Amino acid sequence: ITGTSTVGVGRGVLGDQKNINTTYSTYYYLQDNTRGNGIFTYDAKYRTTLPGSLWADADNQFFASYDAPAVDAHYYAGVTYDYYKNVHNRLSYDGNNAAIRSSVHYSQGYNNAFWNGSQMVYGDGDGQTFIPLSGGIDVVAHELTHAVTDYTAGLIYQNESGAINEAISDIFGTLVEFYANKNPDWEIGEDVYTPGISGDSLRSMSDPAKYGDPDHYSKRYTGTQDNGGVHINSGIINKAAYLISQGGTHYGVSVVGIGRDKLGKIFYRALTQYLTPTSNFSQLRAAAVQSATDLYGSTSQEVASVKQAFDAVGVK
């Protein structure tokens, strides 16, 4: 809509206050004109029609419980935009400042959130398995990173390529969570999963086995469920990424940690320059090694640590 750029205030899913960029034309709309071609957040009104209505509010105050999913979808899309622009010089998910559109209150009791090829879609959860999923910055950035992948390497969504696709989204979801630097960790979805249970999450990057996911290539899932285990086998790559950043000793292999920023630079370069739709784990290792070589030199600690981490998880 055409209007004046304004700044509203509200509370997110977890009760935290934050400012949001809005547009004023009779109503205050969740339309942030400060980032690229805009960030737009929509009310799906418990339907499955998309995108729904551009979110309208009478007073630029967003403290109602019904507002909270919209506040967080809008704000965390902004954080994700800021991460990709400030850290990687990438303008929105397509690198060409595409508008970021999000719909909240999608369907009823819907325990999922997804990038659908042109926008983000957030269920409210059923209140037991999940609360509204836009409350999780890592979920928001995980799904928007699928769009990044789609516009770069094009990793399919099955078998090893799909597990890399998933891990890439977990890695950058987590790096966005650290960039926001409110309550970061190496867990996925902890803020919105199981409100009755403290200390759990959908999966752990630092210890995938905590939830039964593999932390070594020899433990990879080879069945047909979950598109060949894409959310399961991602633990193998997630653990390698965790080791690259934080270091550690894993199955007897010592990894010297190089920190989060270099982890992100290495994997971003691998994703955008070297991966292809059918890259497998071994090819991801090669891409990460070459990316670290490009950035830091073949004799660098960074290259050596990439190799150590993939050795530790059994990927040659």
Ligand X SMILES: O[C@@H]1[C@@H](O)[C@H](O)OC[C@H]1O
Which residues are annotated binding-site positions for Zn(2+)? 142, 146, 166
Query: How many angstroms separate the CA atoms of 203 and 300, rounded?
Result: 31
**Orientation angle between helical segments 260-269 and 68-88, nearest 10 degrees:** 80
Residues near Cl ion (CB under 5 A) are 207, 248, 250
Q: Which residues, 6+ apart, have CB-to-CB distance to 252 below 8 Å?
A: none
Which DSSP string corresponds to 48-72?
A: S-SS-EEPEESSSEE-SGGGHHHHH
Question: Which of 61, 254, 282, 298: binder of Zn ion (CB under 5 A)?
Answer: 61
| Nearest alpha carbon to residue 227 among 164, 271, 313, 152 | 164
Asked if 311 touches Zn ion (CB under 5 A), the answer is no
Which residues form the interface with Ca ion (CB under 5 A)?
A: 138, 177, 185, 187, 193-194, 197, 200
Known catalytic membership, residue 143: yes
Choose which of 111, 248, 293, 307 interacts with Zn ion (CB under 5 A).
248
C-beta closer to ligand X: residue 68 or 140: 140
Residues 20/31, Cβ–Cβ less than 8 Å? no
| Helices assigned H by DSSP within the chain | 68-88, 137-150, 159-180, 225-229, 234-246, 260-269, 281-296, 301-312
Residue 231 annotated in active site: yes
- Out of 228, 235, 237, 309, the residue judged to bind ligand X by CB under 6 A: 228
Q: How far is CA 155 from CA 139, 150, 164, 257, 276, in A?
A: 19, 7, 8, 27, 6
The tokens describing 185, both together, are 């960790």
Choices 64-72, 128-136, 177-185, 301-309; region in contact with ligand X by CB under 6 A: 177-185
Is residue 57 within the footprint of Zn ion (CB under 5 A)? yes
- Tell me which of ligand X, Cl ion, Ca ion, none is bound by residue 194, counting a contact when its beta carbon lies within the kind-specific cut-off of 5 to 8 angstroms: Ca ion
Residue 121 Cβ vs ligand X, minimum distance, rounded to whole Å: 23
- For residue 115, the minimal CB distance to Zn ion (Å) is 7
Q: Which of 280, 279, 278, 289 is nearest to 311 (CA)?
A: 289
User: Look-up: residue for tokens 């369907």?
Assistant: 107
The binding track of 89-128 with respect to Zn ion, each residue x by CB under 5 A or -, is ----------------------------------------
Pairing of the two strands 61-62 and 4-11: parallel
Catalytic, out of 143, 160, 216, 250: 143
Q: How far apart are CA 160 and CA 230, in angstroms?
A: 7
Question: Which of ligand X, Zn ion, Ca ion, none sits in contact with 197, Cβ below 5 to 8 A by type?
Answer: Ca ion
- Give the footprint of ligand X on this chain (CB under 6 A): 2-5, 23, 33, 38, 87, 159-160, 175, 178-179, 185-186, 206, 209, 212, 216, 218, 220, 222, 228-229, 233, 246, 251, 260-261, 264, 274, 279, 283, 286-287, 290, 314
- Give the footprint of Zn ion on this chain (CB under 5 A): 57, 59, 61, 166, 169, 183, 185, 226, 231, 248, 250
| Catalytic positions, written as ranges | 143, 231
